Structures are given as C-alpha cells and as structure tokens.
Design a protein around this ligand. Structure first.
Ligand SMILES: O[B-]1(O)OCc2ccccc21
Ligand SMILES: OB1OCc2ccccc21
Ligand SMILES: OB1OCc2ccccc21
Ligand SMILES: [Zn+2]
Length: 260
C-alpha cells in the first residue's frame, strides 16, 4: 500500500533512475565478473575477516530484504586488508535471492547466476558512522558471497528458523548471539572492484569484495527465504522473491583477482 521503490514491473530496477539518476552512473553495481579479463594483482593483501567478537542484535524485514544487524559502536567485527586501506566495521548483513534456484544473485560470474547472494556490509571507521560513510567514495566495503543450492549450511539455519517471525515489512525480532563466521566459505580468494549500493539510493561508495567460492545451502533453506513478504501485515501478500538488481555496465573499471 505505501509509495516505495521495489522489484516489481512498476517500481523495479528499470524505474529507479528517475528518482536516483546515479543509477546510470560510472560505477554502478552489480556487474558481471568476466573471470578471463579480471587481472591477478600480486599487490593485493590477504583479506582479514575478524568476526570473533561480533555482537548481533536484531533481524529486520525492511520490505526489500531482511537485515541481521550488529552492534557497530566498537571495533568488534572488522574487515581489513585485501584491497582496503584502513578498517571497516560490520553493521549488517542481508541477502538477495530468486523465485527459482537458477537466479537470485546480483553479481554474476561469466554470466552465471547463483540462487542467492549474501552481502556483509561494513563502513570505513575513518568516517565515524555509516551515514557519513555513505557520503564518501571509499565509505563502504561489502563482502559478497554466492549461494548455490546443495547441502545445507548449518550456520544459516538460525537465520532460516526466525524468518516466520518477521514475515512482513516492518517486523523485527531479537537476534543475539549469532556467529556470522558460519556463513563464510573455506577460501577467501576474491575479486574486487569499485562500485555502488545495489538498491536506492545507489550511492557510489562501495569497495566490492566478491568471494570466488560459493557456499552451499539446502533447497529447504532457500525455500524459506521465498515465504517472506514485501508487503506489510494486513496487506495483500506479495512474496519476497527476485530482490536482485541485474548486472550493470562495467564502464571504465577493472576487476582485480586476489588469486592466480
Ligand atoms: O545491496 B545493498 O544495496 O542493499 C542494502 C545495502 C547496504 C549497504 C551496502 C550495500 C547494500
Ligand atoms: O510509489 B509507488 O509505490 C508502488 C507503486 C506502483 C505503481 C505506481 C506508483 C507506485
Ligand atoms: O520514479 B518512479 O516511477 C515509478 C515509481 C514507483 C515507485 C517509486 C518511484 C517510482
Ligand atoms: Zn545487498
């Protein structure tokens, strides 16, 4: 019932440029990762993902995805190294997923679409908070992880099991004591490039770090994502599926690989 951007024919990615002309900008995300033209950069550092002191707080259905939110008021869960200068603090994670196992990811790999994509969102501590960070060209670092359907991911199950309590837009629930390390693959090999948010306001503030190795989740786990709703409670049901933006033009960018 409310006026909002979304993923429908009438309010989806093809419309967003009218309110957010940066949608047609020079560093938009996601992109297709052409693995054959990405260059290995020996100058890149190992990525340092340090999530041992992470403090999860809450899970929220914001009408576009669900966010698992963290206490970012101290250096507790940080990303550094790789392509990054300085230290970026974890604020939230969320996913993008499809109506069918053959689509759902935002980034693609040689045109391959995965069933879903996880975004671990971090802000550059030099700018003091998330709101100020998104006003900067190096304000955010997003760790992107592909999901394929296969074996269950045990570290995902606590998330799946709470989704029924946040079915509709605006619902939240406690989500303490969640260890986000259980959402990572074994390998930290990655691609990186400069880009943007993949949702309005589409701000060009992101260093993307996209892991090469997908995680596998079960058919049952991703089905439960698809029972969420875009609508509010008491409104007609519109399933939260296909909340992904398609690949955008690479323009004058290079994608760098951390591996040979
Ligand atoms: O993928 B997204 O555009 O969704 C919300 C978000 C927040 C921070 C960085 C990137 C994103
Ligand atoms: O502001 B709007 O939110 C959803 C929608 C659908 C059609 C036309 C306008 C709007
Ligand atoms: O600029 B827009 O064209 C269609 C629409 C729907 C919802 C929100 C914004 C827009
Ligand atoms: Zn995202």
């Amino acid at each position: 019932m409310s006026h909002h951007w979304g993923y429908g024919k009438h309010n989806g990615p093809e419309h967003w440029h009218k309110d957010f002309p940066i949608a047609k900008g020079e560093r938009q995300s996601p992109v297709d990762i052409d693995t054959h033209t990405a260059k290995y950069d020996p100058s890149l550092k190992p990525l340092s993902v340090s999530y041992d002191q992470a403090t999860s707080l809450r899970i929220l259905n914001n009408g576009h995805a669900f966010n698992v939110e963290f206490d970012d008021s101290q250096d507790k869960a940080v990303l550094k190294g790789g392509p990054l200068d300085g230290t970026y603090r974890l604020i939230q994670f969320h996913f993008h997923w499809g109506s069918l196992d053959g689509q759902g990811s935002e980034h693609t790999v040689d045109k391959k679409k995965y069933a879903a994509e996880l975004h671990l969102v971090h802000w550059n501590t030099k700018y003091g908070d998330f709101g100020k960070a998104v006003q900067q060209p190096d304000g955010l670092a997003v760790l992107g992880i592909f999901l394929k359907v296969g074996s269950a991911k045990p570290g995902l199950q606590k998330v799946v099991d709470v989704l029924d309590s946040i079915k509709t837009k605006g619902k939240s629930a406690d989500f303490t004591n969640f260890d986000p390390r259980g959402l990572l693959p074994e390998s930290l090999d990655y691609w990186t490039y400069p880009g943007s948010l993949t949702t309005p306001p589409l701000l060009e503030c992101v260093t993307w770090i996209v892991l090469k190795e997908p995680i596998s989740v079960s058919s049952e786990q991703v089905l439960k994502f698809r029972k969420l709703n875009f609508n509010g409670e008491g409104e007609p049901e519109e399933l939260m599926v296909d909340n992904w933006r398609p690949a955008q033009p690479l323009k004058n960018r290079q994608i760098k690989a951390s591996f040979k």
